[PDB]
């Protein structure tokens, strides 16, 4: 089974926000969750990472919060710019190889 599942594709508009939900299998409750940007995959930049609780982490234009009742972590990116498009990953931090799931972001420009 896949430890982490999100949307393969998500869309946002410049100046708006977008929200990505990554579900994870229940056993990964007590592991830190993260949202990572760019390529190559194992060298992506971690934008935000939880502390393995339900507490919100917000850094720069990005927030993440883990719902450990329903096993879904929610990422929001606000005040979107065209440079926010591209490849991202929902991830779980563990010793050794992290579970990761690729999300591709499309951004449309202001008229
Ligand atoms: C994916 N990462 C950039 C957050 C860390 C490196 O990946 P991994 O070796 O822990 O799987
Ligand atoms: Ca790791």
Tally of domains in the chain: 1
The pair of three-digit structure tokens given for residue 107, joined into one six-digit string: 């951004």
- Calpha distance 46→36 (Å, rounded): 4
Query: What residue numbers bound the domain in which 107 lies?
Result: 1-111
Whether ligand 1 lies within 6 angstroms of the CB of 21 is answered as: no
Resolution in Å, one decimal place: 1.4
Distance 49 CA to ligand 1 centre (A): 12
Which CATH number characterizes residue 36's domain?
2.60.40.10
Whether ligand 1 lies within 6 angstroms of the CB of 47 is answered as: no
> What's the residue count for the chain?
111
Catalogue the E-assigned strands of 14-93.
Answer: 18-24, 33-37, 45-49, 57-59, 62-67, 72-77, 86-92
Identify which ligand lies nearest to the alpha carbon of 31: 2
């Amino acid at each position: 089974e896949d430890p982490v599942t999100g949307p393969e594709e998500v869309s946002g508009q410049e100046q708006g926000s977008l929200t990505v939900q990554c579900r994870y299998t229940s056993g990964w409750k007590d592991y830190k969750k993260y949202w990572c940007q760019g390529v190559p995959q194992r060298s992506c930049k971690t934008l935000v990472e939880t502390d393995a609780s339900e507490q919100l982490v917000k850094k720069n234009r990005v927030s993440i919060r883990d719902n450990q009742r329903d096993f879904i972590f929610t990422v929001t990116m606000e005040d979107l710019r065209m440079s926010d498009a591209g490849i991202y990953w929902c991830g779980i931090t563990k010793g050794g190889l992290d579970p990761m799931f690729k999300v591709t972001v499309n951004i449309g420009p202001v008229p």
